[PDB]
Every structure is written in C-alpha cells, then in structure tokens.
Design an enzyme around this catalytic site. Structure first.
Site, short mmCIF file in Angstrom:
data_model
loop_
_atom_site.label_atom_id
_atom_site.label_comp_id
_atom_site.label_asym_id
_atom_site.label_seq_id
_atom_site.Cartn_x
_atom_site.Cartn_y
_atom_site.Cartn_z
N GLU A 1 87.45 17.03 21.31
CA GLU A 1 87.45 17.26 22.74
C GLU A 1 86.12 17.77 23.27
O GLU A 1 85.10 17.63 22.59
CB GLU A 1 88.65 18.03 23.21
N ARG A 2 86.12 18.34 24.47
CA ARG A 2 84.88 18.81 25.09
C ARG A 2 84.35 20.15 24.63
O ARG A 2 85.07 21.14 24.71
CB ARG A 2 85.05 18.89 26.59
N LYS B 1 96.61 17.18 30.60
CA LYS B 1 96.97 17.55 29.26
C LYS B 1 96.45 18.92 28.93
O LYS B 1 97.22 19.78 28.60
CB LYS B 1 96.47 16.59 28.19
N1 LIG Z 1 98.19 22.07 36.57
C1 LIG Z 1 97.30 21.55 37.43
N2 LIG Z 1 97.30 21.88 38.73
C2 LIG Z 1 96.31 21.40 39.54
N3 LIG Z 1 95.38 20.51 39.34
C3 LIG Z 1 95.39 20.22 38.04
C4 LIG Z 1 96.31 20.66 37.05
N4 LIG Z 1 96.07 20.05 35.83
C5 LIG Z 1 95.12 19.24 36.11
N5 LIG Z 1 94.63 19.30 37.41
C6 LIG Z 1 93.48 18.58 37.87
O1 LIG Z 1 93.30 17.68 36.81
C7 LIG Z 1 91.98 17.79 36.26
C8 LIG Z 1 92.08 17.30 34.82
O2 LIG Z 1 92.96 18.06 34.04
P1 LIG Z 1 92.63 18.15 32.57
O3 LIG Z 1 93.45 19.15 31.77
O4 LIG Z 1 91.15 18.16 32.41
O5 LIG Z 1 92.93 16.60 32.16
P2 LIG Z 1 93.25 15.98 30.68
O6 LIG Z 1 94.73 15.86 30.74
O7 LIG Z 1 92.51 14.69 30.78
O8 LIG Z 1 92.63 16.92 29.67
C9 LIG Z 1 91.65 19.28 36.50
O9 LIG Z 1 90.26 19.50 36.50
C10 LIG Z 1 92.24 19.52 37.90
O10 LIG Z 1 91.31 19.24 39.00
MG LIG Z 2 91.19 17.54 27.95
#
Ligand SMILES: Nc1ncnc2c1ncn2[C@@H]1O[C@H](COP(=O)(O)OP(=O)(O)O)[C@@H](O)[C@H]1O
Ligand SMILES: [Mg+2]
Ligand SMILES: CC[C@H]1O[C@]2(C)[C@H](OC(C)=O)[C@@]1(C)O[C@@H](/C=C/C=C/C=C/c1oc(=O)cc(OC)c1C)[C@@H]2O
Ligand SMILES: Nc1ncnc2c1ncn2[C@@H]1O[C@H](COP(=O)(O)OP(=O)(O)NP(=O)(O)O)[C@@H](O)[C@H]1O
Ligand SMILES: Nc1ncnc2c1ncn2[C@@H]1O[C@H](COP(=O)(O)OP(=O)(O)NP(=O)(O)O)[C@@H](O)[C@H]1O
Ligand SMILES: [Mg+2]
Ligand SMILES: [Mg+2]
Lengths: 492, 467, 466
Positions: free
Chosen positions: B180-181, B154
């Site tokens: 969020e964080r 996300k």
């Molecule tokens: N576009 C992307 N390409 C590669 N890996 C990704 C991508 N988006 C997410 N990831 C992996 O997913 C993890 C979590 O994505 P993040 O945005 O933190 O999740 P959330 O949707 O829970 O906020 C990232 O730290 C990465 O390792």
């Molecule tokens: Mg997040």
C-alpha cells in the site's frame, strides 16, 4: 599485448535490432548499469543472461552493428540535478535542448532511488494552491501529495497543470522561501511542436524562471521516454531533500507505459494483461511513491506529483486508469460531456477525490467548502431523480437551487489562477445563500463584477482573510455586507 | 553452501551452487552489499541452479556475485518485543529505534492449522457502524473482508475499525501494510503514538507493525503479508491471546505474485493471473485463522481491479471470509459514506438463531425495500412516476430515506465530510431502521436522513432544515 | 559488398555477408533480376547475417542468391524536377515520361527537426467548409487529420480541400498515395493534368506525386509515406518554400508495419500490432512539420478499422495533429455530408485569443446546444417529443436546424448530392450560426437548412418549400 578490450569491462555486439543489443562480454556489468557504444551512444544493461547482456539503447540503434565494442561505465544510471536546470529544457538524460548552452551542474542523482520510508516523512499539511476553485475547493492538493489528472483526449488535462505552474508566480516572486514552489514538467511521447508551444506560454507567463522541462517526445527512443519520468523525478528530489519545495507534472504516464511495453516486449519479456509487462503497476508505483513530505528532521522539504493518464471512451474503470488511481492520493476526472455542456473545467465532482481532505486547505477555504463536496454529490443525484418534477418538497427545491448556483461558481476560464482569498470570497457568496435568488445565467457575470469590487475597493478584507488565513467574525460580517449590498445594486 | 549469480532479470535471480543445493523456500544472502539482500529460492531449474525471487532491488548485482545459503526460510524476530515496533519483510527494524531483542525467531513459511484445530464459536463483534452491524455483523475471531475498487473507502473503513475496536481491545494487534501507500504507514504510526497504542518510552505497546509498501519490488510484496501474519500467529499460539490482525491490502500479495510469474516461466492463467493463484492464496489464507489455542480477528482489505468483483482475485478471496463488507463506487459516487453495498454484503452470523429475529427481520426488511427500489429505479427513470401505485411510491420514498440513514459520518473522515464522527450502538441502529420501515417518519425529508448518526439526529436535522 | 540470400519469407529476406556487414537502414540490391529489387536492412541477427525488408514482391528469389550493399539507404530524386512527375517508393518514375533528372538525391530516412527548430506561429486556414471552419478550424503550417471508417468521406474531403485550398496556393504541393486505390492515383493525375497543376509541356507543375498503393507488397507500403515525406522536406528546407502535403491514407503505413512485424520475429503487442507501433509513427510523423526554415501544411486521411477509434492505430495518431476531423458513419448514414462529428472534432486554434471571441462564442454555442440535445436523446427515443418541456422542445428545434445547417454540398460530390458545390466564407458561417442560435429562424422548417451554403440560401429554400 593490447589489453584494452578484455571481456570483463568491455563486450562486443553479438546482434542489434529494434533498439536491443545483445552484447557479448561485459562480464562485470551490474544489472541496470550504463554502458557506452563506439558511436558515443549510451545504453543500459537490463538483462544479465548467462551468455549475453541485453542492452536497451538510449538513441538511434542505426549506428550500431554486430561486433561493436561496448564499454562499462561502472555507474548505475543518473542525471544532472539542481538549481542550474531551472528555466531550461532538457532531454531525458539531462542534456539541454534549448541550444542555450551546457547546464552548470555540480550535482548528480540516480534516476532510480527508492522513495523515502515511513520515518523520514510527516503528514501533508501545507496547501499547494492550483488557482482553480474547483480543485482547490473540492479536491484539495497538499505538498508531498500525489493527485492524478485523468480523462479522455482533449478534455483539458494539461491545462490543469499549466494553470498550476503559473499560479505559483505569486509565491515565487515573493519573499517567503517556504512558500516557493519549483516546477518540473515532463513531456512524454508528446510532439515537439506542442512542447515548444508549451514552453512558449510558460515563458510568456514568466514561469520558465522556476520551471525545468524534461522532454522525451514522440520520435525519442523508447528508453528515453521510459526513463524520462524517473529522470525528472530525480531533479525534483534535489529540492525535496534540501528543504525546498517542488512540483512535478508527468505528462502523461500513458505514453510512457507504451514505451515500457515496447521496450519490454522487444527484450522478449512475456507480455501480460493488455499486452503490458506484468509489472506496469510497479513501473508507476515506484515512481509516484517518491513524491513525498519530509519531516523537519529531513529538511521539511517535499515533492508533489501530478501525473496525467488518458482514458478511452471516458472509461475510468480501465485497467491502467485503475492501476494509477490506486497509487495516487486522489484524482481529477475530466469529462468531455461536462466540457461541452459548458462546465469548464470539466471536473466531475462525484468521481474526483482528494485523499488528503481539508488538511491541505487554509481555514478560510475549509470554512467555505467544508461540506460542499457531498452537497453537490447529493445535488447531482436529485437533479437526476427529478428530470420529471415528481411531487417535490422544499428541502429539495432548495437543494437544486443551491446546486445550480454553486455549479456556476466553480466554472473558470484558463490562465487566470485565482488567489486563495479571492476564491473564498466568491464561494462564500454562494454557499451562504446570498445568490440563491440570482438567475443562474447571471452568476458568472456577477462573479466578475463582485470580484472586481472587492479587489479594487476592499483589499483590506482580502488582505486580512489572506493574512489571518481564516474568516474572522468581523470579516465574515464585512463580507456579508458587501455581497448583499453589491448584489442588490447589481440586481437593479 | 555458496552459489554464484548467473542471471539477473528484474526481481528474479538465478543462482548456481557448486556443492549442496539450498532447498526450496530457503533464504540466501547476497554477499557484497551495503544493504542486506535476501533471495528466496523459488525453483530448482536443474544443473545445480536455482531460480529465486529477490527481497529487494537487483541493481548493481553482477553475474558471478557470491551468495550463501542461509540454510533456512526467512525467519523473523517474533515475540512481545515486536510490539510498538516497525519491521521489514525480513524482520529488520525500520523505525530507527535499534535492534529487536526477541528470545526467538520464526520462519515466515509454515503449515496451516489442521482441520481438528478449528473452532466454531460465533459471537457478534459490534463496531458502531450502522450498516455493518445491521446487515453484516462481524464476528469475534472471524475472518472479515473489506472489498472495494480504487478509492472507495477500504482504508478509511479499516481506519475507523481500528479506532472503534482495536483501541479498547485488551490483547495485541498486528497491522501489516502490504503493497500500500508509504504515506499511510506514517499516518498510522504517528497516530498509534499520539494515542498511546504505541508507546516509545515503555512497554505499554499494544500493536506491532510490519510494512512492505508499493515502493518495493514484487519480491517484498509477495512476502510482507507472511511476515505480518507470522508475527500474529505467535501471539495466538505461543501466548494464546486474542489477536486482532489487520492487513491492508491483501490483494497486493496476489498482484505481487503475478508480477514475477512470467519471469518464472509460466503460461498465464485467465485475466493475466498466474496459474497458481488459488493455491497460492489457499496456503496463506489458511494460516490466517482462529484455532483452539488462540483467536485471531483479521480484517483484510481487498482491492477489486477495475471495479470488477469477478476478477479472479477478489473473486477467489470471498470463500476465505466469515463476513464481507462490499463497498461500491456507485454508492460512494453519491456521497454515501461508508459506501457499503447493502445488497452485496454478508455475514455468516446473519442468522436469527444467532442475532435474533428483531435483528434479522429488520435487516432483511431493509434489504427487501432496497432491492424492491433497485428494480424500479431504471424504470420510473424513463416511464416516470405517475403510473406508480401509492403502494409502490412509498417504497420509493422509504427506500431513498434508508439509503441515507445508512450513511454515517466517520470519526476518521472529518477531514473528508466536514462532520463530527458518530458511533451508533446496535439497538439504536435496529430501532432507527425499524421505525423508518414502519412508516414512522414518512413526514421528515430524505435529506434529514443523510450523514447523521442516531435516528434522533435525523429528526433534529429535519427541523434545522425546516429553514 | 556481396551477401547471399539465406532465407525468404514474404517480404522478409535474410541475407548473409562475409566481409562487409551493412548497417541498418542500408539499401541492398538483389542481383539476378529482371527489375530492381531493393532490400532495406532492418537488423543484425548476429552470425554475420542481416535481416531485411524487401521493397517489391520476392517471388523467384533463391537461397544462395547474390545481394549487393548499395552502401546507403533508399535515396530518391529531389528537386523541382520531381514536380509534375509520379514516382515510386524507391524514387523511380512510373509515369512513363523518362528519368527524373535532378541534381540532388535525398535518402528517405532523416531525423526529425530539433526542438530549437520548432515554430509556434498559429494562423487560421479557412477552408470554406462550414463545420470545419466553425468548430475545428485548421491552421497554416499546421497538422490536420481526417479520421474515417470505410467509405465515410475521407477522400472526398481531401479532394474538396485540395480544390478549395491547394488550387489557389502559391508554393508547392505533394500528394502521397499510401495503401490506397490505384485508380485513385489515376483519377487524380489526369485531373491534375486538366486543371493544369500538372503540365506535361512546361515546367509549371506545382505538384509532385508519390504512390505505393493497395497492390504493393507490405514493405513498399511501409515506406512510401517516408518517400513522399522526403520530397516535401526538400521544398521546405532547401527552398524555404510553403508546402502542402496530402497523404491518403496514413493508416496504411501502420497497417503495413503490422504486416511484416511478425516476420521480423517480434512478440505482438495489443490487437496483433507490432510493439513498435508508436515509435514508428513517431519518427515518421515528426518529420511532417513546419519549421523555422519552411512551412508544411499537411492533410492526412486516417482510416479507422472496423470503425473502432480506440484501435491502436488511430488512437495513437491523435497526439500528432493540430486539428482533427473525425468522420462518422452514423452521421453519413443520416445523410449528413460531410459526415463530421461536431463534438468529436477539435483544433488547437479554438482559442478566443486566436479566432476572436465572436468565433469562439458561436463555436462553443453550437456545441453546447448539440450536447444538450444529446442528453435529451435517451428519452426522445422511447417517448418521442410529446413529454418534453416547452423549453426542451426548443433546444431540439434549434439543434435540429443547427444540425442541418452543418451539412453542405461539395463540388467534388456534386454527382451525389444532386446540388451545386458551395464554399462559405468564415464570417458567413459565424453569422448564419449566430442567428440560428439566437432564434432568428425558429419559424423556418428544418429542411430549409439541409444541404446549403450561406444562411441566406436557407431562407430562400424555405420560400421554395412554401
Ligand atoms: N468513511 C468515509 N467518509 C467520507 N469520505 C470517505 C470515507 N471513506 C472514504 N472517503 C473518501 O474516499 C477517499 C478514499 O478512501 P480510501 O480509504 O483512500 O480508499 P481505498 O478504499 O481506495 O483505500 C477518502 O480520501 C475520502 O475523501
Ligand atoms: Mg488504501
Ligand atoms: C447519431 C447522429 C448524431 O449526429 C449529429 C451531430 C447529432 O448528434 C448531436 C450531438 O447533435 C445526431 C444525434 O443527429 C445528426 C443529425 C442528422 C440530420 C439529418 C438530416 C437530414 C435531412 O434533413 C432535412 O432537413 C432534409 C433532408 O432531406 C431532404 C435530409 C436528408 C447530427 O449529425
Ligand atoms: N478552463 C478552461 N476553459 C476553457 N477552455 C479550456 C479550459 N481548460 C482547458 N481549455 C481548453 O480545452 C482544450 C483542451 O485542453 P487540454 O488541456 O490540452 O486537454 P488535454 O487532455 O491535454 N488534450 P490532449 O492532451 O491533446 O489529449 C484546449 O483548447 C484548452 O485550450
Ligand atoms: N462529402 C460528401 N458528400 C456526399 N457524399 C459523399 C461525400 N463524401 C463521401 N460521400 C459518399 O461516400 C462515398 C465514399 O466516399 P469517399 O470519400 O471515398 O470515402 P472514403 O473515406 O474515401 N472511403 P475509403 O477510403 O474506401 O474508406 C462517396 O463516393 C459518396 O458516395
Ligand atoms: Mg495534454
Ligand atoms: Mg479513400
């Protein structure tokens, strides 16, 4: 005119049961303040109601009776903090339990302090080496990062934490203070004998010297177990706020939640989803936010957290599991399936992640494992898709051949944390295809051989890779040489 | 008026006023605190006692403590002088750069635009993301939603959109981090700066920031989105500009509410949610909107508890959107980033009359095959592949290839993928798929289709893979 | 002190006092009754009233009835004079053999041994049971747990162990029957008599028996564990004795707890259980332990409700054992006895540095093969073995024979197996398992392995078939 017991600074137990006292005066207590019972038993003012104060008791409520005098303390709950604690085992309040004498504390800290904001921190950039290839290569952990260890009972969760603490001797026995890492281990709801075992091993590994162990075990009152994590946290911020580095293990946050649930329900706070208070998310968020990386303006210190959570029937989707996974900067998911299969640590590549990425990795490591993660993911898939050798091409035959070899390399025993350069060497060997022709079964043995060779003979390459922190052009060339040749002798 | 605190239980504080009862929504300030504590009046319990939600910690509060009715809902500094700055739920600067000298102030609570204020223009907003664009195009001024369980992308997705869109965008931008964080606001702030979106020396700031992170009490969390949204409505109405609104993660607004709900004395609705979920959501989401005065382009990240899209929250939010990107751990689990679900993501503009039939036929074409393949997955699993008709084993082929061509290396995830981020133009997308669908690459290997930008890289990569 | 019965609901009797309010945990004696009725104080409701839990049926009580503060908590006879005797929750004899004449009396509520008091010596306890010994070995002074849904083998396993271990044990033993069948107590007592562990003539009995069965009111069932527990504590600390403590079934305690919990007026936690579940297990489980002063090897049977191991009760219990034997209906129904789940039973001793690597390696060897079998299982299920690889079919063969060799006849279950009970020595198990693994028996039929002791017997059974 005996005026010692006025109802403003003192109160009297109206009733007591199940660890909840409903105290009668306490007109000037503040929410969350600590009070004292005739019995020297400390409690905490959680509900401030029109006609009574709901006090949670930090101990056996058996000694409390209707009528007892309760005294304010004037203080919001806090605990001993600082270097004095290292090598000692304390309870949820700070008191020693190793019967090795009082702690020489000169500093205190409120257990409940908001995590530093936006301004005071800087992006996590320094690695926090576990000693475990799998981890350090695929789901990197940097300082100030929060990474979760999650899995069913006995999948090996604690081991990940122990090996880490132990791997820290390298730097702590060393010169550099920036590289040093003080460790904190919080046992929650656990069993005394298990903890005692734990502290033994730490001692036997010469790790106690830099560790503090806050213990709030199975027979400890609910509130102790509850407070325990925040307690240990506070001891960690000491280091964090003083340009020093700390690592804290919350083992585990599952049992604390139940304590919270209990404590909470007994205060008559309506139960929520799954019976827990509506704020369990908050209960953990608040805590883990505290693990952080401070900028140079604030000492550049940091707090890194490794909370543990227990799933049931390996179901990670579970409400609590997901509650915590959505707070941390990644998770290490251990499966019993993998475990039994031989894959120890039972890290599930696909399901475990690190939201810090390579920024928490040395170039050496980034160099070798930069694409490995998604490679293995993609491997696992085709490995499934061909559990029937379906008209398979080459790119995929190569894909399964690497997959298997690499999977073997990420295997690892206990209590033998490897040094970063060591890891790079071994991964190197694999990733580069030098092992694509070795028999999978051989791999593990090879790695022991190989590693032997370079450590003993070649520490010059090891020390350079280690030192430069990168894999130079000549290092990459001295490496090729060794592997290929040794491999051959080996494949005699 | 001046009331006294009579009870404290968590984030909920009951106040007794002797004379003049502050109306609902009114903000009250707790006297005697090193820091400013605002209490939002939530209910009139009767007996001249109001039940309120604290905008901050309640430690240290004492029964009898003094409280003054501010005489108005939480009002924040709104205006251009918010740009480049970091604000609180309550409008306080939290960036350590001094006061926010706005000409005016605004209450975070306000009525949503009337029906006769609605606009119906619908123009594609190209993002550069193969998946989105191809299959669920975002629309300028529309409501966009990024759905995903924990750790599926996300945020990253919201991150690349800021890069691919916010960055060129000539107009303001308001990013509100809700529940969020904290680490994340620091990453973002410092990125806005290193890229001049935020300017600390001059007035070239093109982005205002508002934060109420996970380290806050339910109260704050229940409001930051309002604060954020409030800043954004200014630039929409009072300036009339094209705003871009980013909220990460709107779920947190709702979980915030659930967290105090019981203390407010309510029977729980299903899944533990408060019974006012929908309406609570409604009166808010209805403000987040484009009107005739100005245009908002909101990108909201939406958390999906337990990965269950049916959860009353995520579930209740779908109706508020014009375009939806649904992410899936099952996809991510395979290494396919961005992990969008091609058969669960939709856009209101996915209309031939709007994007055209080449666009359309392709999209739909892409979706048929993936569906066609989904159906077969579980079956050839057991029964194997032999009995499958060549006709049917070519779609297994093409499907697996498409599944890949849909992945893409983001520019904000190099730390993750170990690949340089690629941005693809709309036609490069349409064409690339068009071709795969056409049988024009049945020779190249799937892997050649994994983590690449434009179709040419898939062809180039074939060769590199050719050993 | 004299209070008056204020309210009565099931086992929850509320008593009011005027001058002396008794502390929580104190035992009150209801006045005006044919037999002893102890009430244990549970909480001060304020208004000078106390809410207590009866230790026996409450029928007949009347509001306004007189209750007397005993001044202390339930206290019970401890010493060697309890040896060979059967006693109540409240320590009265129920063996119709007179009063238990002891020097000291102990209260059933004590605090758990402190951290500094803990012990960390880890010695393996061989039981002669193949599966247990090989895969989830028990340990001297350790904590063992037998998890089992209804009629799966919990009790039979305890008996067999009592037989194989308790029988030739130096120190003392304490059996505590909690919430189980009365006939079982009776079955045991008389058997104990026979083999002389209980001697009604001399002072040579090695076992003390405590019971509060399926027929007692909740409060009793809720405390008997504590009672047996106490007795054991005596031998441990007061005589630095090496104890054995058998409990059947500890689940019952928690169940009992859930029975009165609503009556205590508590909001229920998940699945209707008391919010104090974990802590109650805690302050109780934590006294059942070995210390610097003495050793307590304890085997406890853990009933699993509806066969759901995720039930709060069992779930919360795992964390208190050193070794766990999870029994399976599926296995038992397949005819495998003991119905032990090999991939689900664990032991903190399954460490190479403790069982030796030979042991360690067969152990993990066996599990690996069964795990492997497991994945093949989806397919074997629709399509059978035909479509399997030559290599795969080989795991299956081996797994089916390893799977069969894991079963074994217990003396105690002779009446059902139709075979003579067997005890296999560890080295014999380590061995027999290597060979199997190592393909030394790929020629024998599966059936040969079923229901046998040592491998040697399996070879023979093969001749007999052929
Ligand atoms: N576009 C992307 N390409 C590669 N890996 C990704 C991508 N988006 C997410 N990831 C992996 O997913 C993890 C979590 O994505 P993040 O945005 O933190 O999740 P959330 O949707 O829970 O906020 C990232 O730290 C990465 O390792
Ligand atoms: Mg997040
Ligand atoms: C679902 C039960 C599973 O539990 C096991 C541990 C296996 O799971 C895996 C991981 O291993 C399993 C699939 O199959 C069982 C095998 C049972 C075998 C039963 C054999 C009975 C049998 O075998 C013989 O050879 C001769 C016999 O009668 C004379 C009899 C009754 C094992 O206990
Ligand atoms: N890398 C490893 N290789 C081999 N054995 C391991 C590995 N790491 C852990 N272990 C062993 O595996 C078992 C599980 O360890 P442990 O970390 O306690 O899992 P856990 O999740 O803590 N279990 P519990 O907390 O009791 O639910 C123990 O026997 C460890 O000795
Ligand atoms: N080891 C065994 N070998 C053969 N049959 C057995 C064995 N253990 C149990 N059984 C059979 O299973 C029945 C139930 O055994 P038992 O030990 O009473 O189960 P349990 O777990 O005590 N039942 P309960 O306590 O009612 O849940 C026995 O009477 C035998 O018929
Ligand atoms: Mg553990
Ligand atoms: Mg039984």
């Amino acid at each position: 005119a005996d005026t010692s017991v006025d109802l403003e600074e003192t109160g009297r137990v109206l009733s007591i049961g199940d660890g909840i006292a409903r105290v009668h005066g306490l007109r000037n207590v503040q929410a969350e303040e600590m009070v004292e019972f005739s019995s020297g038993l400390k409690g905490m003012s959680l509900n401030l109601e029109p006609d009574n104060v709901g006090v949670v008791v930090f101990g056996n409520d058996k000694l409390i009776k209707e009528g007892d005098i309760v005294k304010r303390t004037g203080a919001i709950v806090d605990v001993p903090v600082g270097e004095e604690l290292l090598g000692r085992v304390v309870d949820a309040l700070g008191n020693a339990i190793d019967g090795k004498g009082p702690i020489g504390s000169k500093a205190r800290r409120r257990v409940g302090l908001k995590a530093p904001g936006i301004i005071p921190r800087i992006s996590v950039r320094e690695p926090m080496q576990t000693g475990i290839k799998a981890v350090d290569s695929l789901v990197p952990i940097g300082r100030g990062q929060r990474e979760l260890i999650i899995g069913d009972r006995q999948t090996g969760k604690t081991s990940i934490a122990i090996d880490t603490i132990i791997n820290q001797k390298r730097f702590n026995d060393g010169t550099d203070e920036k590289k040093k890492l003080y460790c904190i281990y919080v046992a929650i709801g656990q069993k005394r004998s298990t903890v005692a075992q734990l502290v033994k091993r730490l001692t036997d590994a010469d790790a106690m010297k830099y560790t503090i162990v806050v213990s709030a075990t199975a027979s400890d009152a609910a509130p102790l177990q509850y407070l325990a994590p925040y307690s240990g946290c506070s001891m960690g911020e000491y280091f964090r706020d003083n340009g020093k580095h700390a690592l804290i293990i919350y083992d585990d946050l599952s049992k604390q939640a139940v304590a919270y649930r209990q404590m909470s329900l007994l205060l008559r706070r309506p139960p929520g989803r799954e019976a827990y208070p509506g704020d369990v998310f908050y209960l953990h968020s608040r805590l883990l936010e505290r693990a952080a990386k401070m900028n140079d303006a604030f000492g550049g210190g940091s707090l890194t957290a490794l909370p543990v959570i227990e799933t049931q029937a390996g179901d990670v989707s579970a409400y609590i599991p997901t509650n915590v996974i959505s707070i941390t900067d990644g998770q290490i998911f251990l499966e019993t399936e993998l475990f039994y299969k031989g894959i120890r640590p039972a890290i599930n590549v696909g399901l475990s992640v690190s939201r810090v990425g390579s920024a928490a990795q040395t170039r050496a490591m980034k160099q070798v494992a930069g694409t490995m993660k998604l490679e293995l993911a993609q491997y696992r898939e085709v490995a499934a898709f061909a559990q029937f050798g379906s008209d398979l091409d080459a790119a995929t035959q190569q894909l399964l051949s690497r997959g298997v070899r690499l999977t073997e390399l990420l295997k690892q025993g206990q209590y033998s944390p490897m040094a970063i350069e060591e890891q790079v060497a071994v991964i190197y060997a694999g990733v580069r295809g030098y092992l694509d022709k070795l028999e999978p079964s051989k791999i593990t043995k090879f790695e022991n051989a190989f590693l032997s060779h370079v450590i003993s003979q070649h520490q010059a390459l090891l020390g350079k890779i280690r030192t430069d922190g990168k894999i130079s052009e000549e290092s990459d060339a001295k490496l090729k040489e060794i592997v290929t040749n040794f491999l051959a002798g080996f494949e005699a | 008026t001046t009331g006294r605190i009579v009870a404290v239980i968590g984030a909920v504080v009951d106040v007794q006023f002797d004379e003049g009862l502050p109306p609902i929504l009114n903000a009250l300030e707790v006297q005697g605190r090193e820091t400013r504590l605002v209490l939002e009046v939530a209910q009139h319990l009767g007996e001249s006692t109001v039940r309120t939600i604290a905008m901050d910690g309640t430690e240290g509060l004492v029964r009898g403590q003094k409280v003054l009715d501010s005489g108005a809902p939480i009002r924040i500094p709104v205006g251009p002088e918010t740009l480049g700055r970091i604000m609180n739920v309550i409008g306080e600067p939290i960036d350590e750069r001094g006061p926010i000298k706005t000409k005016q102030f605004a209450a975070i609570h306000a009525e949503a635009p009337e029906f006769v204020e609605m606009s119906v223009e619908q123009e594609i907003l190209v993002t550069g993301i193969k998946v989105v664009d191809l299959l669920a195009p975002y629309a300028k001024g529309g409501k966009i939603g990024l759905f995903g369980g924990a750790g599926v992308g996300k945020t990253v997705l919201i991150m690349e959109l800021i890069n691919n869109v916010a960055k060129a965008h000539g107009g303001y931008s308001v990013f509100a981090g809700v529940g969020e964080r904290t680490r994340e606001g620091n990453d973002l702030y410092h990125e806005m700066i290193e890229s001049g979106v935020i300017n600390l020396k001059d007035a070239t700031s093109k982005v205002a920031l508002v934060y109420g992170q996970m380290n806050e009490p339910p109260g704050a969390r229940a409001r930051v989105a309002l604060t954020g949204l409030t800043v954004a409505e200014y630039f929409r109405d009072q300036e009339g500009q094209d705003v871009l609104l980013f909220i990460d993660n709107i779920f947190r607004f709702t979980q915030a509410g659930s967290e105090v709900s019981a203390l407010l004395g309510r029977i729980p609705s299903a899944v533990g949610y408060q019974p006012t979920l929908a309406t609570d959501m409604g009166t808010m989401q209805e403000r987040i909107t484009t009107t005739k005065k100005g245009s908002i382009t909101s990108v909201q990240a939406i958390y999906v508890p337990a990965d269950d899209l049916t959860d009353p929250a995520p579930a209740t939010t779908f109706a508020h959107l014009d375009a939806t990107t649904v992410l899936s751990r099952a996809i991510a689990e395979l290494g396919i980033y961005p992990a969008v679900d091609p058969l669960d993501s939709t856009s209101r503009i996915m209309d031939p009359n709007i994007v055209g039939s080449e666009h359309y036929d392709v999209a739909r074409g892409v979706q048929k095959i993936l569906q066609d393949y989904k159906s077969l997955q579980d079956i050839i699993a057991i029964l194997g592949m032999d009995e499958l008709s060549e006709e049917d084993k070519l779609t297994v082929s093409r499907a697996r290839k498409i599944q890949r061509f849909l992945s893409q290396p983001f520019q904000v995830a190099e730390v993750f993928t170990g690949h340089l981020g690629k941005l693809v133009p709309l036609k490069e997308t349409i064409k690339g798929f068009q071709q795969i669908l056409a049988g024009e690459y049945d020779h190249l290997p799937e892997q050649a289709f994994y983590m690449v930008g434009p179709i040419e890289e898939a062809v180039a990569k074939a060769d590199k893979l050719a050993e």
